[PDB]
Structure formats: C-alpha cells, structure tokens
Design an enzyme around this catalytic site. Structure first.
Site, PDB file in Angstrom:
ATOM      1  N   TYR A 128      -0.049  20.544  13.540  1.00 18.49           N
ATOM      2  CA  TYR A 128       0.881  19.960  14.501  1.00 18.49           C
ATOM      3  C   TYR A 128       1.987  20.971  14.863  1.00 18.49           C
ATOM      4  O   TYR A 128       1.735  22.178  14.867  1.00 18.49           O
ATOM      5  CB  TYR A 128       1.452  18.700  13.876  1.00 18.49           C
ATOM      6  CG  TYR A 128       1.981  17.623  14.772  1.00 18.49           C
ATOM      7  CD1 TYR A 128       1.126  16.789  15.485  1.00 18.49           C
ATOM      8  CD2 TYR A 128       3.351  17.399  14.859  1.00 18.49           C
ATOM      9  CE1 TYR A 128       1.636  15.752  16.303  1.00 18.49           C
ATOM     10  CE2 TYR A 128       3.879  16.382  15.660  1.00 18.49           C
ATOM     11  CZ  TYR A 128       3.024  15.553  16.382  1.00 18.49           C
ATOM     12  OH  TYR A 128       3.579  14.548  17.171  1.00 18.49           O
ATOM     13  N   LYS A 153     -23.905   1.812  17.255  1.00 20.12           N
ATOM     14  CA  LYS A 153     -24.573   2.833  18.065  1.00 20.12           C
ATOM     15  C   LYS A 153     -23.982   4.228  17.734  1.00 20.12           C
ATOM     16  O   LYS A 153     -24.710   5.238  17.596  1.00 20.12           O
ATOM     17  CB  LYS A 153     -24.474   2.485  19.563  1.00 20.12           C
ATOM     18  CG  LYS A 153     -25.448   3.252  20.495  1.00 20.12           C
ATOM     19  CD  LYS A 153     -26.888   2.754  20.468  1.00 20.12           C
ATOM     20  CE  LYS A 153     -27.730   3.391  21.573  1.00 20.12           C
ATOM     21  NZ  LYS A 153     -29.089   2.774  21.663  1.00 20.12           N
ATOM     22  N   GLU A 207     -23.837   1.962  27.337  1.00 17.85           N
ATOM     23  CA  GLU A 207     -24.847   1.131  26.660  1.00 17.85           C
ATOM     24  C   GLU A 207     -24.637  -0.340  26.967  1.00 17.85           C
ATOM     25  O   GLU A 207     -23.526  -0.816  27.058  1.00 17.85           O
ATOM     26  CB  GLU A 207     -24.871   1.354  25.134  1.00 17.85           C
ATOM     27  CG  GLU A 207     -25.802   0.369  24.282  1.00 17.85           C
ATOM     28  CD  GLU A 207     -27.328   0.692  24.247  1.00 17.85           C
ATOM     29  OE1 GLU A 207     -27.713   1.829  24.606  1.00 17.85           O
ATOM     30  OE2 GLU A 207     -28.134  -0.191  23.829  1.00 17.85           O
ATOM     31  N   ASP A 208     -25.750  -1.035  27.157  1.00 18.22           N
ATOM     32  CA  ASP A 208     -25.785  -2.486  27.288  1.00 18.22           C
ATOM     33  C   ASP A 208     -24.912  -3.040  28.451  1.00 18.22           C
ATOM     34  O   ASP A 208     -24.131  -3.968  28.247  1.00 18.22           O
ATOM     35  CB  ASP A 208     -25.384  -3.118  25.920  1.00 18.22           C
ATOM     36  CG  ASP A 208     -26.516  -3.035  24.828  1.00 18.22           C
ATOM     37  OD1 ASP A 208     -27.601  -2.444  25.034  1.00 18.22           O
ATOM     38  OD2 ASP A 208     -26.295  -3.561  23.724  1.00 18.22           O
ATOM     39  N   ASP A 225     -29.914   2.417  27.630  1.00 19.90           N
ATOM     40  CA  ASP A 225     -30.910   1.389  27.866  1.00 19.90           C
ATOM     41  C   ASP A 225     -31.768   1.718  29.114  1.00 19.90           C
ATOM     42  O   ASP A 225     -32.961   1.410  29.142  1.00 19.90           O
ATOM     43  CB  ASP A 225     -30.235   0.030  27.964  1.00 19.90           C
ATOM     44  CG  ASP A 225     -29.455  -0.298  26.720  1.00 19.90           C
ATOM     45  OD1 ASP A 225     -30.050  -0.644  25.673  1.00 19.90           O
ATOM     46  OD2 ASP A 225     -28.229  -0.191  26.800  1.00 19.90           O
ATOM     47  N   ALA A 278     -38.122  -6.188  34.887  1.00 22.41           N
ATOM     48  CA  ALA A 278     -37.282  -5.400  35.765  1.00 22.41           C
ATOM     49  C   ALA A 278     -35.898  -5.203  35.158  1.00 22.41           C
ATOM     50  O   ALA A 278     -34.888  -5.172  35.863  1.00 22.41           O
ATOM     51  CB  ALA A 278     -37.199  -6.046  37.127  1.00 22.41           C
ATOM     52  N   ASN A 317     -38.337  -7.956  22.819  1.00 20.98           N
ATOM     53  CA  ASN A 317     -37.706  -8.289  21.542  1.00 20.98           C
ATOM     54  C   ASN A 317     -37.166  -9.711  21.466  1.00 20.98           C
ATOM     55  O   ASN A 317     -36.631 -10.223  22.445  1.00 20.98           O
ATOM     56  CB  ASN A 317     -36.615  -7.273  21.194  1.00 20.98           C
ATOM     57  CG  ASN A 317     -37.199  -5.920  20.775  1.00 20.98           C
ATOM     58  OD1 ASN A 317     -37.874  -5.811  19.736  1.00 20.98           O
ATOM     59  ND2 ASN A 317     -36.926  -4.884  21.564  1.00 20.98           N
ATOM     60  N   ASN A 357     -35.370   3.985  20.629  1.00 22.48           N
ATOM     61  CA  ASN A 357     -34.619   4.965  21.444  1.00 22.48           C
ATOM     62  C   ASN A 357     -34.031   6.151  20.703  1.00 22.48           C
ATOM     63  O   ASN A 357     -33.610   7.149  21.320  1.00 22.48           O
ATOM     64  CB  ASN A 357     -33.476   4.282  22.181  1.00 22.48           C
ATOM     65  CG  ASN A 357     -33.955   3.497  23.340  1.00 22.48           C
ATOM     66  OD1 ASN A 357     -34.988   2.846  23.283  1.00 22.48           O
ATOM     67  ND2 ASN A 357     -33.253   3.603  24.433  1.00 22.48           N
TER      68      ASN A 357
END
Lengths: 761, 761
Positions: free
Chosen positions: B37, B92, B134-135, B160, B193, B285, B317
């Site tokens: 610092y 994740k 994600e998601d 995803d 889709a 899933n 993944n």
C-alpha cells in the site's frame, strides 16, 4: 529509488497481483462438487427464492464488501485512470481482510459521469453486503455517494470522505477532554477542501461543535457565504458568517486547526496567534503542513497529529473502516449512517484511554505509550481496535434500526472477533472462560500463583495482560523495591498492588527451612544449606506451594529447563505413581493433538510410557473430549525386540489401567492420526477415529516432532507444559514469549482448581 | 430429500458461503504493508499510467475472470432472481479455480433490460481480464453477448451458449470419424431452442456440416423460414428449407440427433427411423430425452451421450470453459473468438483418442476406458484436459491475432500448466527434464530397470505413465504369459513390447547361480540354495544389476521393506564406506528439506550419522543447491552424555570429511530449519541460512517426524528412497501408490546415470 523498484518486484514476482480466491469448503471429489454445484446447489437457490433473506445464510454476501473506484482520485496522484488505480484497490481489500477479516472484490470502473457510474453500480447490489467507494474526485464523489446511500438497500461508504473525520474526530474528543475544552466553545479552522474536509465538520459538529465556531478554507481562502469564486453545491454547506478572508485571519484565536492541504501551509506566524493549547491536525501527504518538532518549536503547548507513521498520533483510516464495515455486516444492516459513524468515534476515543498493552508496545519496538498529548488515538495496529469498535458499531446499527439481525451474546461477539486470527487464541479463550467457570463456583476465589523471577521483563509484561482477564492472583519474588523499580521502569502500572515477597524476610521462612531440612537432610543437606537454598526464590516458591501458602507456581523464564524443574520436584514431588512429563498442544481447524513427553524423560520405559499417556488422557478428558491414544513407533505392530516391543507392551499396560479408553500400539505416526489408514490396513486395531494423543517412545522423537510441526506444519503449537506433580507447577523455557507465559499461567491456574476439586472429594 | 438438507449444511456451516479472498504476498509487518500500500503502491500505479499494458504485470488482472448473471436463467430453475442465483455463481468460480487455476468474482446483477445491464457491465472492463456470462435467458442473452463482445476489449463469453456446442462438437467429430461419416453429408436435427441450440449449429457447421442438412426444432415443431409463430431475430439463423413440420418428420433418415429439451422427447419410434449408426446426444437435465439402455433397446447400433455422470460420455462444460479462458488469459487476448472455440473442439477430440491413463481410470473407480463408442470425449476429470486444450487455445488466439503477448516455450507452458496443482509435481518434472538432459548426452540411451514383481497391478500401471515420459526401459520378472495376462487384464496396451524374463529360463542363470555361490557359500549357501534363491525374482534382479545386465532395479510393492531390501544388500552391496539409508523429500514453496535415515538403521552411531549426512549432501549438491546440514537432538549444543554427544561428535566427523560444507550439531529441530533462531541464540553456529538437510539421531525420531509432517504439515512429502548402494537400487513400501512408484523409478534412473558418470571418470 531502490524502494520504488522493491515495490515493483513485490507486486510482480511469483503470482502477479496481490489477491487470489480459494474455496471455503472441501472441493476434491465427485461428492464435494456434487454438493457445491449441480445437482446440489439447487437446494440453497430454491430456499433463497422463497425467502430472499436466506441469501446471507448459504452465500458469501455476509462478508463480501466491494471496493469500487473510477480512479479519478488515486491517493495523491489524482485522476490516473481505473486501470492504474487497481493495485491500490487490491491493497485496500487486503487491508479489509487483514484488519477485520473481511473479503473484498476490487472493482475498477470506466465512467466519469456521475450517472453512468451510479447506474452501473447500483445494480450490483445483490452481490455485496456492503459497498466501499475509494479515491473518487470531488465534487463528483459527493453526488455519487449521496445518491447511492439513498439508492441501495446495503451500506454505501466513501472511505476518503469519512475516515479522516472519524479518527481525527476521536482524536479531537480526547484533546478536548485533555485541555478541558467544551466542543460548543471550540473554534475549528479547516484548511483544505478535499474529500475529507466536508465530513470533518459534519462530525465535529455532530460531536457538539457550533458551526458558527467553524471556519472552512480552500485554495482561495476562507469560504464565506456568497463567495462565488470556485464553489460547488457541496462546499456551500459550511461557509461562515466570518469576515476573515485569508487563512491567517481565520486562525487568529482559533482552537483547533484541521489541516487537509499541503506542507508549509501552516506558518509559525499563525501558530503564534492560535489559542492557548492549540490542537493541530496536519495530515497532508507525504509531508504535513508543519513537522511536529517545528510546531513544538513555535508553541510548546501545541498538541500535534499527522498521518505519518514515524510521528506520534498517526491518523490512519484503518482505525475506521474495517471495524465499521464489520459491525455493520454482522447485523445485516442496510446503511452505514451517522449514528454509526459517531458510535465509532466514541469507541476509538474510549479505547484510547486504556493502558497500552505490551503486545502493542511490542508492535512499535518496545516504546511505552500512555493516554495523553502523545497518544490521542489507538495505534493503527492495535488488535483491540476491532474488539472495541465493531461491537459498538453493531450496537448503534441495531439501536438506529438499520439492522436486520440482532446480536445478543455481546461477549460471544467479541470472542469471535478475537478468534478471527488464531485457532490457538480461540483455545486459550475457551480455557479462560473455563477458569472463570469453576472460579465463580468456588467463591470467585482466584488461584494464588508465585512467580519467582520477579524482575523478569517478560513475566511482568505477561502478568499485565493476565490480571485484566482476572486469571490469577500474582505473587512475585525478589527484593520488593528492586522489582517495583522494574514495574515503574516498564511503564506497567496495571499491577501496582500485587504481593511482593523477599524470601529471607518472610515470617514462615524458618518454618520452611526446617521443613526442607527434614525432607532433605539425609539427601545431602545440612541445616545451613537449607537456609541458603530457601533463599533461592525457586525453592521458596515451591515450598510456598507444598505448604498451601499458594496454589501454584511458574518459572524458568530466566533459567535452563532442568535447573528450574529440579527444585519443584525436590520440594513438591509427584503423587502416587506419577511421572514428570512435558506436553504440547497442536491446534488444527477441528481437533487438536496432544504430544508427550517432550522435555523430561530421555528414553522412557514401557511402564513410564503408559503413565505419560494416562495423564495425557486425564488432561484431554478434562476438556470433555474422548481421548484416543497411540504409542508411536517406527513399526506397524511388530512387537519386535526393541522400541516396538516397549511401546506395544506400553499400550498393553495402559489398557490394563484404564479399560474404557481406546489405546493401541505399537504403530507408526501416520497410522495413528489418520483413521482411514487405520481402517484400511489394520482393521483389527482397537483405535478408530484417528489418534488425538501421541506418546513418543523417546525424547529425540518427541522434541524433534513438536519443534518440527511448529516450524513446518503451519498448524499452531502451544507448550511445553508440566504434568504429574502433586501441585499446580509449571516450567517455561527461556525462549518463551509473553503469550507463552500467559497461557502457561492459565493452565497452571486450572490444574490448581482441579487440585482443589480432587481435594474436596 | 436428505441430499437437499446435506447441501444446505454444506453451504451454511462454518464460514457461510463458498468463497474467501487471501493475499498472494506477505502482509504481516510495517514493511509488508508499506510495500503493498502507501507509500509503496505508488510505484506500480505510476508505471501503469505511462504504459497501460503493465496493468497485467503488477496486478491480478491476468488471472481474474468475472462470472456475471442477472439470474434470469439459473440452471433449470429459470428466472429466480440475482439473489438466489448467487450460490450457483460462487460454485462456477470454484470450478474455474479448481479446473484451470483461475480466480473468479461472482457478480449478481439486478437488470433485465438488455441496455441497463450492458451499460453497467461494459464499464467493469478495467477490472477483469475476461468475462464469463452464465445462466441468462434467451433471447436477451444473445443481444447481450453479441453486443458485449463488440463493446469490450477483453473476452466475453456466455458459457451456456457455447459449452454444450464445443464438447458435443468434439464428440460429434469423433463419432463421425468412428462411423466413417463426412460432416458435409451429415444430417443433424436439433430439438430444443435454449441458449445452447443456436451455437451448436454454428459449430458443427464450422466443423464442415452443411446448413441445408441441418434442421432445427423447438416447442412448436420444425423451424421453417417464414414461420412467424414464436420466433425471434436469433432463431431465424437456422430455419430450414425443409417441409417437415413435426420433429418426427425431421428425424426421418437423420444422422445425428442433438437433444436439448426434455425427457421422453425422443421415442423408440423415431429411433427406428433414423439413419444407420445413429448419433444421439440427449442432454436434457436431470433426465435425458431417452436413457442409454432404452435407446440401445430400440437400436443397438446407436451411439449415445448425456450430461449425466453415471452414463458414458458425460458432456459437461468444464471440458470447455476453464481450459479456454486459461489459454486466452495467458496470451492477454481481446476476445474469445470462433477460431479459438474450434481449436478447443479439435483439442478435446484429439485428446479423446489417447490411451486412458490409470490416474483417470482411478478417478472413476478403476473402470478401464478406450477410445470408442463408449468414450467420445475425455472424462470431465482428466488432469490432461488443461494441458491439451489451453495451449492450443492460446496457439489459436496468437494465430488469429487477438493476442497481445506471445508464448514461445510451449513445453514450458505445458509444464507450468501441470505445475498448477502440485509443488511436488513441479519437482518430479524438474527431475524428468534432468533425466532427459543427461540421457540425450549419452546417446539417448535409457537406464535399464528391472521390476521383479512383474505381476504387480501398481507397478504395471505406473510403468504405463512411465514410458510415454521416456524415463526408462522396463524389464519385468515372472512367468512371461502369466504377466502378459495381467497386462491384457488391465487394459494397458501402452507396454506391449517390454522385455519379460523368467529367471530359471534365462541363459545367464547358471552363470549367476555360480557367482552368488562364491559370494555366499561361506555365508550359509550350498550350490543348491543359490539355484533356488536365484529363482526368486528379487535376487535375480539384483544379480542382473551387479553384473551390468541392467542399470538398476526397484521392488517392494508386494513385500515387507526389510524382506525386499535384504537381497539387494547381499548381492549389490555398498561402495567403500557406504551405509544403507532411507531418505525423504519435504517440499515447500521455495526450498525443500531432506530427511534421513527413516527406514534402515535403528540407532545409528556417530560415524554412521556423519555418513548418512554426507550422502544426503552429495544428493542435494546434485540439484545445484548448497547443502546445509543439522544433526538433530533434543538439546541445543549440550555435548551431554548420550544422544547430544553422539550427534555433536557426528557433525564433527562430517566436517572432518567435507570441510567446504556448512555442518553443525548438536541442535534441536527448530533451531535447525530457521536461520533467525540460529542467529539470535547461537550466533557462533557455523550453520546459517537455515538447515536444508536433517539427519535424525535414530529411527524413532525420523519415521515419526516424516510421517507426521506428511499427515499434519500439509506441505507435500515424497519418499522414502534408498541410498548408498553400489548400483542404482530402490525399495518401495507396500502402501506405495502409483505416483510413488513412478517418481521412485525416476530417481532410480537418475542415480543410474550418475553411476555411469562416476564410471566414466
């Protein structure tokens, strides 16, 4: 500079950066990850869906604070960008974690528009439990925080805005109590209009100062109402009715100078013209408005404070934010409000008056500190800061109603706060709570403990911390005035009233030399030698203990282990079937392991190993834990001639003596501590669940094992402690540190209570 | 479910959450913080100001990836909010760190407008080196990433969207090479889709598939051009010229079914009507479109893959993003582009064909795997994934020109990649590089090494990994067909060509039994006993070594340490003044410590301790390190009768033998390893800089010390290894794991090379 390049390699070497993220739960197996992620992580998510609150129970929110900046005001380098400002942020997070155990994300944002930036920040709210802005320019910053605190249902706090105000605020409180001032009659002059200036007034005022008695300056002189030259909506808060236009005219007759600008801004000329007992906060960096020595030159009655570490009264923000965010976070508060900031100033200034612990004197190279003109605020590095500030912050946040979770066991709260660094520290705290527990059951009476080396720096300093924990009643030995000299020499007034005894002078002296005489005349002592040995503080101590003139003793802070253990043994002795034995504690996350015998017996026989172990088991049973014992060997059950046979036969004896206990041998080390190795390879073994008591076959193995765990194991180790004596007795090593001396005393006290209880039966 | 509640306590217990942040550099002192610092941190900031690039050199950017979401698509629970979506994100990040050593911040954002969210995210760019979305729901997500990749000069990637495509893509490559298909004639039907569907096509197509041969479905049947019912701008990419309107009509004669929807969506009726050798990716899933067994029921010629861990070909993944972000990050790339995503598919599918390592078979309970219909993609838990994928990702990012820093030493890159978990692993890699180094200097010749226990599961499996590292030429012992049975039994074809020798049958057998005879006839051996002992593979091995029919040997994977060490000693013997001694390595962050003797000698004499040490020093000198030796004791220089005298006199002998070396005694353990304790207390000591070689006074102390460090020290320990024999020889323990067997072999090989070199002189 070489220092500049040293900083560069500090950051660059090894893993670049200054931060890393790890898991807080196991993460090794198909199972571990089937819990932390799919299909398992569904269970907390669904639970947060039904009740949003539970986001604090299953996630890291409860300890996660974001340090955010756009790098428009980094330290004193200014608007140098979000990129260049990052390391300073990583570092600010490090500070958070090291000073209050708070996890921190550094977020460098590329927006200088007040609106882009806020619109970007406010939507991070589900991520963090609290938000720390740092190093953002005026006056943008005011608009940003003023907006955000309103916007977000978590706390938002710009550290540069309020820190200086809170610490320099506690500091002012003290100086004002010192010089017998009243806030409402104090005149305060603020030179500088940085982030901090605006909030300083808010706080001094909130402490009781009259805003009419407050004048505020900037790069263009006094801020008078209606001056239009270089104003913004926010400076306009504290313009004065005063006619003074230059700084000097403002400081004429001023009580306190709040210096927030540049060096040399404060002349000896202005100093001559401030009030009696001038309070000077010169906090400019890297160099103050005036040096403390140059200020003491013009006015010796001046009290002076800076942000520099090499001058007294270092005003560093770290006294502030960590403790604060902590207290907020723990109560799941929605803001950091004024009630809280003030509660923090009141805590800092209250702590400042407590006698300065020897841990703290230690941090700063033995220098002694007492509350006064040269100590206005706790040193930045006081481990007590947190313990004193955070609970009062939470207390405020609960009283002010911004909190969503209530802390009830205050003591517990502090306990956890200490616990923060130290898996051993928690243990000694359990211990102390347990001293207090049977203390209060036998009349609040404290175990009397004699310290023969009464002029020992380390023993004294330890005692200091000892008493305010009300562990024991200390009795020191030496010449009474030659020790009160050393108590006054160490600035340690904590203990001005403890018994101090000269052996030769004490009334029972002769009764003692006679009792030594018959115990040892047929062992090489005439009537003369007993007179002269009883003159040794050690023998005097032990004899005090044997006769019940004290409940225990501790020494060996000055002498070789042996030299100090011998008089104990020759006077106190052991109980029936006892063996003198040195024992250690190894402290892990969950369990602890017990190591013995590590000081005393050179190559113990089987009978002796079984006794070492049995004692170690009474000791672990004392803490309500099931003792599991392994006689360590180089072999897995060989019974072979030599060590293995001794240890195997040893365990066999130990079981012969306590059949309810899980005891085995001979076995290797790893085979001991690990229950998995045990069930896989030797499923016949009576020892399951891994050993928690390790008896060594000899002294070489135990001393090398304990000192090697201490140095490499990076698990924490306390000891060695003495066991098996008739009375509460304990030997230190010369290498013993003060911490060591105080927990060693704790055990002594306890065993003493345990002795009293065995007596009661 | 009990599993649900177990997940709850996993997250809730101890420290709530699943993440913590620590410092990557020391942070204990006034000095440490004066570097991290103020005033120190100024030096990097100023340097970043002048050149922005250097933000990667002094900060954590280079390894910091943000996982961001608004929680509008968490797993399969959907738009459950940013709050409830947090744990899944923490997790994740955990995955990032554990699978590619990448540090990760979880960022939960409260904005469902594409524009709020992007305007908030893009301005975080200075903070992170790369961005993982994600998601996040369709079709918002497409707009968000499509925008962001353009917006930001760091990589942006929605996991995803592309993961499923990349892994199922490598998988398709393989299935297509398997069934002798060509991508351009493949018909592919995508049912579903979701996030993933859109990118699947992009990738199969990018691998060579014709989009005319691709039909894409959703909840309303086939997507045909001009269908307006339930479209968005993004689905419109892959509408087909086809007339089929129902799924079934699409799957008529289809080659590959990409199932991205719900269970039962795939009937045995449609299955009957797919092409010969149907490729079925059912990844719904928690339950697939059809179970592998129900699919093998309708069509046995079907290849099947899911995301479930308990069926073959788990498409997870994690095969993808970690390796990828890694490779990007290391080259300081500005994007993750298609060149890269494809380079990743090509790496995964290439790795899939390599023979499956026994480490991996181990991860999944010994099950053997070979490239085929039941193994299309590396198992999620292959430690090789990273090593194979990340360097090719970087290779692509450099070739495609999005990179700003070039990796040159590819091997080095991989080496560091392995290094990622394992301060020991790095060491064995140094070792192996050093085997290759003097190997290539003496003609590429490899040390011949005999493994007497030729039917040992563990020895074989170790050898497997051994050869592809080209460490040694393995010679196994036993009945040739009874061992080739065990090689074929373990599905380990790596080593179909190694020498396999039956002792009794070998030509030099008799020459050997005669040479044993004269070496031992006057030590209890007649001509008969030598015939029958030479029939023991062990004695046969040793005699092979003594005569130069091999350069070394290793056993004791099946036998007691002693039982296996004796023939070695009786045949090979030691060189002049040698002592048989077991030695360990303790591996720290910087240095390593050497421990001895931990298996052999029970209570070694002074002369013996000095020799143990001298050998240990030749060994440490071999690695170019200055050896520092301590004769450990329970005392600090007492010279007292007993152990201390033995060790003190021991060191004295050792110096008498090698005066250039820093050697001392007697001293305690901690006094050894710590140079600070040494300079403070015994400044006279010739040992400074802390000991790196620890000789124990006896077997109890050393076995208990090493196995205790291994279990508690949480620093890593390899060994024990054998030293002092005339020839390269080494004993394993029965408890030895495969890793142990392979590094043990490495040392054997090296010492062998060292023997050859001592010969050359």
């Amino acid at each position: 500079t070489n220092f500049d390049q040293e900083a560069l390699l500090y950051h660059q070497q090894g893993k670049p950066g200054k931060i890393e993220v790890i898991s807080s739960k196991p993460c090794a197996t198909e199972k571990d990850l089937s819990l932390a992620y799919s299909p398992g992580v569904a269970a907390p998510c669904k639970a947060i869906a039904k009740d949003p609150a539970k986001v604090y129970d299953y996630t890291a929110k409860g300890n996660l604070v974001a340090v955010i900046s756009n790098g428009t005001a980094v330290l004193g380098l200014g608007n140098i960008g979000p990129a260049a400002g990052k390391p300073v942020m990583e570092g600010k997070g490090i500070l958070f974690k090291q000073f209050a155990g708070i996890d921190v994300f550094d977020i460098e944002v590329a927006a200088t528009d007040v609106d882009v930036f806020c619109n970007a920040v406010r939507v991070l709210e589900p991520t963090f439990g609290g938000i720390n802005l740092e190093d953002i320019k005026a006056p943008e910053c005011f608009e940003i925080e003023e907006r955000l605190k309103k916007e977000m249902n978590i706390p938002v706090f710009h550290d540069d805005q309020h820190g200086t105000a809170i610490v320099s605020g506690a500091a002012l409180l003290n100086a004002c109590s010192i010089t017998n001032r009243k806030m409402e009659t104090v005149r305060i002059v603020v030179n500088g209009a940085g982030a901090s200036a605006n909030s300083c007034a808010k706080i001094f005022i909130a402490l009781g100062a009259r805003r009419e008695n407050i004048i505020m300056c900037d790069s263009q002189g006094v801020i008078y109402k209606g001056r239009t030259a270089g104003m913004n909506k926010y400076k306009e808060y504290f313009a004065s009715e005063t006619e003074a236009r230059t700084l000097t005219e403002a400081l004429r007759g001023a009580d306190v100078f709040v210096g927030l600008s540049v060096a040399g801004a404060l002349t000896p000329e202005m100093l001559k013209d401030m009030a009696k007992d001038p309070i000077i906060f010169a906090m400019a960096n890297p160099e103050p408005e005036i040096t403390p020595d140059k200020a003491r030159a013009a006015r010796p009655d001046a009290i002076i404070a800076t942000g520099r570490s090499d001058y007294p009264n270092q005003v560093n923000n770290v006294l502030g934010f960590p403790s604060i965010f902590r207290g907020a976070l723990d109560t799941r508060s929605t803001q950091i409000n004024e009630e809280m900031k003030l509660a923090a100033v009141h805590a800092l200034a209250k702590l400042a008056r407590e006698d300065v612990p020897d841990k703290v004197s230690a941090t700063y190279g033995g220098k002694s500190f007492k509350f006064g003109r040269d100590y206005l605020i706790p040193k930045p590095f006081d481990t007590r800061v947190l313990l004193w500030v955070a609970p009062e912050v939470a207390k405020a946040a609960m009283k002010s109603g911004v909190a969503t979770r209530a802390i009830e066991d205050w003591d517990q709260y502090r306990e956890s706060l200490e616990a923060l660094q130290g898996p051993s520290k928690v243990f000694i705290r359990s211990a102390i709570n347990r001293v207090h527990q049977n203390s209060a059951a036998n009349g609040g009476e404290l175990p009397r403990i004699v310290f023969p080396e009464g002029t020992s720096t380390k023993v004294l300093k330890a005692l200091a911390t000892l008493v305010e924990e009300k562990i024991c009643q200390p009795i020191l030995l030496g010449y009474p005035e030659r020790v009160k000299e050393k108590i006054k020499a160490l600035d340690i007034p904590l203990l001005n009233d403890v018994s101090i005894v000269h052996p030769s002078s004490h009334p029972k002296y002769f009764s003692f030399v006679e009792k030594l005489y018959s115990l040892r005349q047929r062992k090489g002592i005439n009537l003369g030698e007993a007179e002269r040995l009883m003159a040794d503080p050690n023998y005097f101590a032990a004899m005090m203990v044997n006769q019940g003139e004290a409940d225990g003793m501790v020494s060996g802070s000055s002498i070789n282990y042996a030299d100090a253990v011998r008089p104990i043994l020759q006077t106190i002795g052991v109980y029936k079937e006892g063996i003198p034995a040195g024992l250690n504690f190894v402290l892990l996350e969950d369990k602890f392991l017990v190591l013995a015998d590590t000081t005393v017996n050179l190559n113990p026989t089987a009978e002796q190993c079984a006794q070492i172990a049995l004692q170690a088991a009474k000791i672990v049973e004392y803490f309500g834990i099931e003792p599991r014992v392994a006689m360590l060997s180089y072999s897995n059950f060989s019974g072979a001639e030599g060590t293995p046979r001794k240890m195997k036969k040893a365990a066999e004896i130990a079981r012969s003596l306590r059949p309810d206990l899980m005891i085995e041998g001979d076995m290797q080390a790893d085979t001991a501590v690990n229950p998995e190795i045990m069930e896989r390879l030797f499923p016949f073994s009576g020892l399951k669940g891994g050993a928690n008591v390790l008896v060594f076959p000899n002294l070489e193995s135990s001393n090398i094992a304990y000192k090697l765990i201490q140095q490499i194991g990076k698990a924490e180790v306390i000891g060695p402690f003495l066991t098996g004596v008739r009375r509460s007795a304990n030997v230190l090593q010369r290498t013993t540190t003060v911490d060591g001396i105080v927990n060693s005393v704790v055990f002594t006290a306890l065993e003493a209570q345990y002795i009293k209880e065995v007596l009661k039966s």
